[PDB]
Write a protein that binds this ligand. Structure first.
Ligand SMILES: Cc1cc2nc3c(=O)[nH]c(=O)nc-3n(C[C@H](O)[C@H](O)[C@H](O)COP(=O)(O)O)c2cc1C
Ligand code: SF4
Ligand code: SF4
Ligand code: SF4
Ligand code: SF4
Ligand code: SF4
Ligand code: FES
Ligand code: FES
Lengths: 28, 66, 207, 54, 427, 117, 108, 230
C-alpha cells in the first residue's frame, strides 16, 4: 500500500544478515 | 566490336566430365594422352559439439542474448 | 506502435540519487559473484522508480555500472511489459479485460469510462496524467473486472465505481484499495465460518 | 495440367497472389524437373511408321 | 473413489482466511514441532510424501514426492538451489494471492524443511511484479520470524539453516513453464531453453536446482506432519489428498473453494452457495481448467467427479483447478476467441511452430466470430491445431491447440448458423 | 494468340515494365537474349543492354510466359524483311520504339487471352 | 496412391519376371546379369562373345520368337574401365513383349 | 571401445557416446533439412526443421540438439517425419514477401532449395503478410529485414568469433526485429563476412548488389594475395 519504501524491504535488515554470503566462485 | 558479345576461339572451353574416383580419374588423361595436375579431397573435422555446454559454472563458453 | 529510437534525447541525462546507490550494494550481495553479472531486473526497474519513464540515456547508464555491453540492456528492457519508454502519466490505470472478466460484465466497466471522463479509448488523456491501458492475467477473476493502480488494486468494480474512482482521483482521493462492496475477506459466503477453532489436534507427526 | 505442380507450372493468376507458387514457378524455369534414373523405350504409331525414344 | 466425497471441514491444511493475516506468534498450526521435524535425515522425508503421492499443483502430474527424492543427483562439487514459483499465469486462477493473502508464515515453514530433502544452499522465490502490496508484506513476514533468530544461519539446532531471496519479474512469461524462470533469474531475455537438454535438474543457474509450486511446498510441512493414513483421503487410488479450488464465471457468489479429490461438479459448483445462472434447462457450458481445457456442454461432466482420470476419461484433463461457466447470455464462440487472443500477447517467439502458427489462427478465429463466407475452413483450422504438439518447445504450443481443438469438437451449429446469417445477409 | 515481332510494354505513365529478373534469358532454348543489368541511380534496378537476335529466335513463346511482371510480349505483326544481317540484331531502344508503335494492338490481345493462362 | 499417379499391374510384372528366368538357365555360358525393369521391360547383360548366339537362340524358337529388331543404339560412358555400351532391342511379334540386350565393349 | 552401436534406418553405425542424431545420420550419408545450425557456430533449437521420427515413441524430437542413447532406430523416412517437415515449412513461408524477381539470393536460397525437394505443394493463408521496415548498418551490407526467417544465425555470429557484441533480439512474439536498436553502425574486420552466413536474402552485398544471377558465373578456384596467410 505504498509505491515507494522498498528500502524497508530490500536493505533494512537483509543487509545486516545476508547470510552470509559465501556463494562460491565462478570467477568465470 | 559490333555488340559486346564475348566471342572466342579456344574450342574446348566448355567440357566437364564426371568421374567416379581418383583411380579412374588419371586413367583417362593418359589414354588420350594429355598432361594433368591432381587436387585433393578435403573432409572436415569430425567434430566435438554439444548443446548444453553453453551454460557453465566456471567455464568460459556461456552464451546470452538468445 | 514501434520499438526504435529516432533520437529524441540521446543525453537526457538521468543520474541516480546517492540514496539509491547504496541500495545497489544490497542486490549484488544476494547473487553469487562472477555469475552475478546481471542484476538488471531490479537495477533497471529502480531507475523506473526514480523517473517514472526511462529514456535511452538511462539504458546506457546501467551498462557502465554492471560492465555489460549496452545491447544486453536495450534487449531486456523491450521484452517485459511493465517497463515504459514512451512518456507516461501520474496515474497509469489498468482495466483487466480477459475471458472471465468479459463474462463478469466488463461491458459497463468498458466505455462509459469515456462518457464519464471524456477521452479517447485506450488512450492517454489529452492533458497530463490519466493514461488508459488494458492488461491480462492478474489473480482473481473470481472478483469483478477489477482495476489495478500503480500501488494497489480495486476489487468489485461497477459503473458506480466508474462514477467514483474516475471522479475521486480527478480531485485526488484514494478510491478504496480493495473490494468496495461485497465480502471484505473474499469468503465462500455459505461456507465462510466453518467453525473457527484450533486445527483438530496438531501432533500427528509421531508416525 | 497435371496437378501436383512439380511438373506443371501454375496459373498466371496463381503465381501472383500466393507465396508457394513463385518458388515452383521460378525454380521450374531456372532448372528443370528432377527425374529418377533408369532407361526406357517406347513406340507410338507415327503416320508412316513408328517413333521411338531411348 | 469411496463415498463420493471430498467434503469441506475445519481439519484442513490451511490455517484460516479471516483469523489473522498479519505477522503473529504462529499460534497453533505454524511452528508446532519445529526442530524435531528436520532433526532426522533426508530419507525420513524422502519418500515420506509417498503416503499422499502428491501429484503437484503446477499444471501437470509427475508427483512432487518423486521429483525431490528421485531425479536428484547427490553431489559432485557444485552447490544446489531451490526455485519456488509464485507466478499465476493461467487466467482466472486466484490459487495464489490467497495463500499469500492470509497465511504467509506457512511458506517459510517448509522452505527450510523442503530444502533439507535436496540439501540445497539458497532459496529463490519468484513473485509477479504486478502483485506488489502482497509481495511487500511477504518481506515484512520474513522479518517477523527469520529476523527473530528462528531460521538461519544455524537456527534452530541444526547445521542446515539458510535464507530466502525474493525477486520480481515484470510482466513475464515464465509462469507457465520452468527453464524460462531459471533463465529469467539470470538476466537474459527469458526465451526458454529446450526442456530436455539435460533437463532442469542437470543444467540450471550455474548448478542444478529444483522447480516447485506454491502449494507444492506449502502443503509439505503438514503432509510431513499429519501424514497418515489421512493423506489418502478422497478420490480413487490414483490421486490422493485435498486440493484448492476456485469458482469464477457466472455464479451468485464467485468465491474461493476448498475440497478434496473427486467431487461431482453438479453438486460442488452449485454449492458455495449460489448457482445463479441456469442450473438446468439453460446450457451451463463448463470449462474444467484455467486455459489448458476446452469446453464441455451439460453432458456427463456434471456426473463426472474431479479426479485426474475422470477428466482424462473425457477429452481433456486439467490441473489448474479453475471453474468458469457461460449458460445463457454469453456467446460461446466470443469468449474463447479472446483466450486465443491472449496467447498472442504472451508467447515467446522462438519457434516457428508457435509464433506464426497462432497468428495464422488469430487472424482467422476473429473471422469466425464475425460470421463470414464459405465454411470447410474449420477442418483446415482443425488441422493446424493438430499440427502443434511436439513441434514447439514449451507447453504454450500445447496450450494453444486445446481451446481450438475442443471448440471444433462438441459443437456443430456454432458457426454453421452464424456464417449462414452473413451468407443470408449478403444475399 | 499469334506469335511474331517482339516488344517491351510499359505501365501507365511510363516505368519500362521490365525489372531485369533474368528469366526470359534462361529459358530461351536458342540463347538469343543477352541481358546486362546495373543498379540504376534511383535505386530500382533496370537493364542497361537488352539484345534479341531475330535470327536465333526460334519463336517459342517461352519468353512470353516465363515473365513474372508481364513485360516482354510476342507482338502480332509479321512485318519484317530487312536487307542486312547487321540490322536484325535488336537493342533495347529498338524494342521500346517497336513496343510503343502500338500498344492499342497488344493490350487488346492480352486482355482477351489472359483468362486461360 | 491417388489420381495423376500411374497405376501398375502385377500381371506383366510376374510374367516377364517368370519368362526370362530361364533365359539365364539354359544359356549360362554368356548371360551374366538379368534384371527386371519396374515399368514391365527386360534387360539382359551378355558378354560380348555371345553377341551372335543369344540373338541366334532368340531369332527362331517356339517359345521366344523376337523377330523384329526395333533399335540398335550405343552409349559411351567414361569411368567404366570399358567405355561403351551396345544395346540391342527386339520385338516378339507373336507375344507382344520386349527385351533388351546390353553388351559392354571397348574401343579396340 | 567407447561407442554406442546405433541403427540408422535399420542399419548399424558406431558413434561416440555424446554425438548428435544430426552428425550420426550425416555419417551414413543423409542430410536432414537444416536451418538454425551451422557447424562453426553454437547450437540453438529455434526453427524446428529437423524432425526425426524416432522409432518406438509417440513424440518427435529435434535432431540438431540431443544426444544419442543406447542403440535407437533412427527412422528418417516415415509417415510422421514427412508430416512434420511439410508442416513446419508451410509456417514460415506465410509471413514472407513475394520476391524472387529482384531479391539477390535468387539462385541459392534455402526457402527455395528445400521447398521443391521437401516441403509443401501449395499455399493456404490467404491474406496477411506482416511487413517490417529496413534500415542501414554500413556501406558494405545492404539490409532488407522484411525477408528474415528469424533463424538467429547472424546474432550468434557476433557473440561468437567477430567479438563485437552489437546485434540482438528485440521484441516479443511475432513482433520482433533483429537489427541494432540504436542507429549504431556495425563495422570491423570480418564485418562483411556475415552475408555468406545469412541463409535467406536479408543480408546481401552492397557493391555487387544488382549485376548477375548465380547460375551463369564460371567458378575457378584461386588464391588471394593481399595478406600474410594468403
Ligand atoms: C497452461 C499452463 C499454465 C501454467 N501456469 C503456471 C503458473 O501460472 N505458475 C506456475 O508456477 N506454473 C504454471 N504452469 C506449469 C509449469 O511448467 C510448472 O510451474 C513447472 O513445470 C513446475 O511444476 P511443478 O508444480 O510440478 O513443480 C503452467 C502450465 C500450463 C500448461
Ligand atoms: S511454446 Fe513456442 S513460443 Fe512458447 S516458449 Fe515454447 S517455443 Fe517459445
Ligand atoms: S521481361 Fe521479365 S524476364 Fe524479361 S528482363 Fe524483364 S523482368 Fe526479366
Ligand atoms: S521466342 Fe523463344 S527463342 Fe525467341 S527470344 Fe523468345 S524465348 Fe527466346
Ligand atoms: S539476417 Fe535474417 S536470415 Fe540472417 S539470421 Fe538474421 S533474421 Fe535470420
Ligand atoms: S529469400 Fe527466399 S523467399 Fe525471399 S526472395 Fe529469396 S528465395 Fe524467395
Ligand atoms: S485476468 Fe483480468 S483479473 Fe484475472
Ligand atoms: S532444425 Fe535447426 S533447430 Fe532443429
Amino acid at each position: 500500500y505504498s509505491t515507494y519504501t522498498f528500502l524497508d524491504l530490500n536493505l533494512d535488515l537483509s543487509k545486516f544478515r545476508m547470510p552470509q554470503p559465501s556463494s562460491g566462485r565462478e570467477s568465470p | 566490336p559490333l555488340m559486346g558479345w564475348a566471342s572466342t576461339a579456344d574450342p574446348l572451353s566448355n567440357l566437364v566430365l564426371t568421374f567416379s574416383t581418383k583411380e579412374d580419374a588419371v586413367a583417362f588423361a593418359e589414354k588420350n594422352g594429355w598432361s594433368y595436375d591432381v587436387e585433393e579431397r578435403k573432409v572436415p573435422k569430425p567434430k566435438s559439439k554439444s548443446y548444453g555446454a553453453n551454460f557453465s559454472w566456471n567455464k568460459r563458453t556461456r552464451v546470452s542474448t538468445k | 506502435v514501434h520499438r526504435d529510437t529516432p533520437e529524441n534525447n540521446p543525453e537526457t541525462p538521468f543520474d541516480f540519487t546517492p540514496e539509491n546507490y547504496k541500495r545497489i550494494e544490497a542486490i549484488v550481495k544476494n547473487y553469487p559473484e562472477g555469475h552475478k553479472a546481471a542484476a538488471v531486473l531490479p537495477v533497471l526497474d529502480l531507475a523506473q522508480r526514480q523517473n517514472g519513464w526511462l529514456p535511452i540515456s538511462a539504458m546506457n547508464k546501467v551498462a557502465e555500472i554492471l560492465q555489460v555491453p549496452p545491447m544486453r540492456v536495450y534487449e531486456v528492457a523491450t521484452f517485459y511489459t511493465m517497463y515504459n519508454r514512451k512518456p507516461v502519466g501520474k496515474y497509469h490505470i489498468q482495466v483487466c479485460t480477459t475471458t472471465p472478466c468479459m463474462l463478469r460484465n466488463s461491458d459497463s466497466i468498458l466505455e462509459a469510462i469515456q462518457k464519464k471522463l471524456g477521452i479517447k479509448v485506450g488512450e492517454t488523456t489529452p492533458d497530463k496524467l490519466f493514461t488508459l491501458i488494458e492488461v491480462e492475467c492478474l489473480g482473481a477473476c473470481v472478483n469483478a473486472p477489477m482495476v489495478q493502480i500503480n500501488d494497489n488494486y480495486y476489487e468489485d468494480l461497477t459503473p458506480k465505481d466508474i462514477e467514483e474512482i474516475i471522479d475521486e482521483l480527478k480531485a485526488g482521493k484514494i478510491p478504496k484499495p480493495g473490494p468496495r462492496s461485497g465480502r471484505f475477506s473474499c469468503e465462500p459466503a455459505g461456507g465462510l465460518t466453518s467453525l473457527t477453532e484450533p486445527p483438530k489436534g496438531p501432533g500427528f507427526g509421531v508416525q | 495440367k497435371v496437378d501436383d505442380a512439380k511438373v506443371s507450372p501454375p496459373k498466371r493468376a496463381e503465381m501472383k497472389t500466393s507465396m508457394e507458387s513463385l518458388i515452383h514457378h521460378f525454380k521450374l524455369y531456372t532448372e528443370g524437373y528432377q527425374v529418377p534414373p533408369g532407361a526406357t523405350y517406347t513406340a507410338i504409331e507415327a503416320p508412316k511408321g513408328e517413333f521411338g525414344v531411348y | 473413489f469411496g463415498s463420493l466425497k471430498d467434503e469441506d471441514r475445519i481439519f484442513t491444511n490451511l490455517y484460516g482466511r479471516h483469523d489473522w493475516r498479519l505477522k503473529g506468534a504462529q499460534s497453533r498450526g505454524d511452528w508446532y514441532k519445529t526442530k524435531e521435524i528436520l532433526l532426522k535425515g533426508p530419507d525420513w522425508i524422502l519418500g515420506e510424501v509417498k503416503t499422499s503421492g502428491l501429484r503437484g499443483r503446477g499444471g501437470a502430474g509427475f508427483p512432487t514426492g518423486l521429483k525431490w527424492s528421485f531425479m536428484n543427483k547427490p553431489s559432485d562439487g557444485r552447490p544446489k538451489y531451490l526455485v519456488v514459483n509464485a507466478d499465476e499465469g493461467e487466467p482466472g486462477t486466484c490459487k495464489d494471492r490467497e495463500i499469500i493473502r492470509h497465511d504467509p508464515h506457512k511458506l517459510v515453514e517448509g522452505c527450510l524443511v523442503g530444502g533439507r530433502a535436496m540439501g540445497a544452499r539458497a532459496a529463490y522465490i519468484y513473485i509477479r511484479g504486478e502483485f506488489y502490496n502482497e509481495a511487500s508484506n511477504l518481506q515484512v513476514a520474513i522479518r517477523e520470524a527469520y529476523e527473530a533468530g528462528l531460521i538461519g544461519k544455524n537456527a534452530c539446532g541444526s547445521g542446515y539453516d539458510f535464507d530466502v531471496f525474493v525477486v520480481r519479474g515484470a510482466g513475464a512469461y515464465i509462469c507457465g513453464e520452468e527453464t524460462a524462470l531459471i533463465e529469467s533469474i539470470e538476466g537474459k531475455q527469458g526465451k526458454p531453453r529446450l526442456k530436455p537438454p539435460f533437463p532442469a535438474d542437470v543444467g540450471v543457474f550455474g548448478c542444478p536446482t529444483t522447480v516447485a509450486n506454491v502449494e507444492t511446498v506449502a502443503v509439505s510441512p503438514t503432509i510431513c506432519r499429519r501424514g497418515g493414513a489421512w493423506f489418502a483421503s478422497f478420490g480413487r487410488e490414483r490421486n490422493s489428498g485435498t486440493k484448492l479450488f476456485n469458482i469464477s464465471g457466472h455464479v451468485n457468489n464467485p468465491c474461493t473453494v476448498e475440497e478434496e479429490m473427486s467431487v461431482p461438479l453438479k453438486e460442488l459448483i452449485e454449492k458455495h452457495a449460489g448457482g445463479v445462472t441456469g442450473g438446468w434447462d439453460n446450457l451451463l457450458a463448463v470449462i474444467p481448467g484455467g486455459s489448458s481445457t476446452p469446453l464441455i456442454p451439460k453432458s456427463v461432466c456434471e456426473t463426472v467427479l474431479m479426479d485426474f482420470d475422470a477428466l482424462i476419461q473425457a477429452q481433456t484433463g486439467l490441473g489448474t483447478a479453475a471453474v468458469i461457466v457461460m449458460d445463457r447470455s454469453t456467446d460461446i464462440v466470443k469468449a474463447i476467441a479472446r483466450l486465443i487472443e491472449f496467447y498472442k500477447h504472451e508467447s515467446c517467439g522462438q519457434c516457428t511452430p508457435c509464433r506464426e502458427g497462432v497468428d495464422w489462427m488469430n487472424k482467422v478465429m476473429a473471422r469466425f466470430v464475425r460470421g463470414d463466407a464459405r465454411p470447410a475452413e474449420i477442418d483446415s483450422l482443425w488441422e493446424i491445431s493438430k499440427q502443434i504438439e511436439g513441434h514447439t518447445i514449451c507447453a504454450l504450443g500445447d496450450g494453444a491447440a486445446w481451446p481450438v481443438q475442443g471448440l471444433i469438437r462438441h459443437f456443430r451449429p456454432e458457426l454453421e448458423e452464424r456464417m449462414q446469417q452473413f451468407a443470408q445477409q449478403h444475399q | 494468340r499469334f506469335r511474331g515481332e517482339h516488344a517491351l510494354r510499359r505501365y501507365p505513365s511510363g516505368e519500362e515494365r521490365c525489372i531485369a529478373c533474368k528469366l526470359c534469358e534462361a529459358v530461351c532454348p536458342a540463347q538469343a537474349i543477352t541481358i546486362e543489368a546495373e543498379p540504376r541511380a534511383d535505386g530500382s534496378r533496370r537493364t542497361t543492354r537488352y539484345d534479341i537476335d531475330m535470327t536465333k529466335c526460334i519463336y517459342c513463346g517461352f519468353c512470353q510466359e516465363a515473365c513474372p511482371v508481364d513485360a516482354i510480349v510476342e507482338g502480332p505483326n509479321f512485318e519484317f524483311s530487312t536487307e542486312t544481317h547487321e540490322e536484325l540484331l535488336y537493342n533495347k531502344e529498338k524494342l521500346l520504339n517497336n513496343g510503343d508503335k502500338w500498344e492499342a494492338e497488344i493490350a487488346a490481345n492480352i486482355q482477351a487471352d489472359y483468362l486461360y493462362r | 496412391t491417388r489420381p495423376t499417379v500411374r497405376p501398375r499391374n502385377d500381371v506383366a510384372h510376374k510374367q516377364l519376371s517368370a519368362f526370362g528366368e530361364y533365359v539365364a538357365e539354359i544359356l549360362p555360358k554368356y548371360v551374366q546379369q538379368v534384371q527386371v525393369s519396374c515399368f514391365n521391360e527386360l534387360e539382359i547383360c551378355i558378354h560380348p562373345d555371345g553377341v551372335i548366339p543369344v540373338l541366334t537362340f532368340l531369332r527362331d524358337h517356339s517359345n521366344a520368337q523376337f523377330k523384329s529388331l526395333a533399335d540398335l543404339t550405343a552409349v559411351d560412358i567414361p569411368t567404366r574401365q570399358n567405355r561403351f555400351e551396345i544395346v540391342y532391342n527386339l520385338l516378339s511379334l507373336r507375344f507382344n513383349s520386349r527385351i533388351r540386350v546390353k553388351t559392354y565393349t571397348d574401343e579396340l | 571401445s567407447n561407442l554406442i552401436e546405433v541403427f540408422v534406418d535399420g542399419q548399424s553405425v558406431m558413434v561416440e557416446p555424446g554425438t548428435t542424431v544430426l552428425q550420426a545420420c550425416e555419417k551414413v550419408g543423409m542430410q536432414i533439412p537444416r536451418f538454425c545450425y551451422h557447424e562453426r557456430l553454437s547450437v540453438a533449437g529455434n526453427c524446428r526443421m529437423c524432425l526425426v521420427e524416432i522409432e518406438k515413441a509417440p513424440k518427435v524430437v529435434a535432431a540438431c540438439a540431443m544426444p544419442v542413447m543406447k542403440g535407437w532406430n533412427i527412422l528418417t523416412n516415415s509417415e510422421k517425419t514427412k508430416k512434420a517437415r511439410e508442416g513446419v515449412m508451410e509456417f514460415l513461408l506465410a509471413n514472407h514477401p513475394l520476391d524472387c524477381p529482384i531479391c539477390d539470393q535468387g539462385g541459392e536460397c534455402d526457402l527455395q532449395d528445400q521447398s521443391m525437394m521437401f516441403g509443401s505443394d501449395r499455399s493456404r493463408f490467404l491474406e496477411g503478410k506482416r511487413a517490417v521496415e529496413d534500415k542501414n548498418i554500413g556501406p558494405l551490407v545492404k539490409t532488407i529485414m522484411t525477408r528474415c526467417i528469424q533463424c538467429t544465425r547472424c546474432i550468434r555470429f557476433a557473440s561468437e568469433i567477430a567479438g563485437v557484441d552489437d546485434l540482438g533480439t528485440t521484441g516479443r512474439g511475432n513482433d520482433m526485429q533483429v537489427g541494432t536498436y540504436i542507429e549504431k553502425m556495425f563495422m570491423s574486420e570480418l564485418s562483411g563476412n556475415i552475408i555468406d552466413i545469412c541463409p535467406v536474402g536479408a543480408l546481401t552485398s552492397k557493391p555487387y548488389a544488382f549485376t548477375a544471377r548465380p547460375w551463369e558465373t564460371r567458378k575457378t578456384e584461386s588464391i588471394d594475395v593481399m595478406d600474410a596467410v594468403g
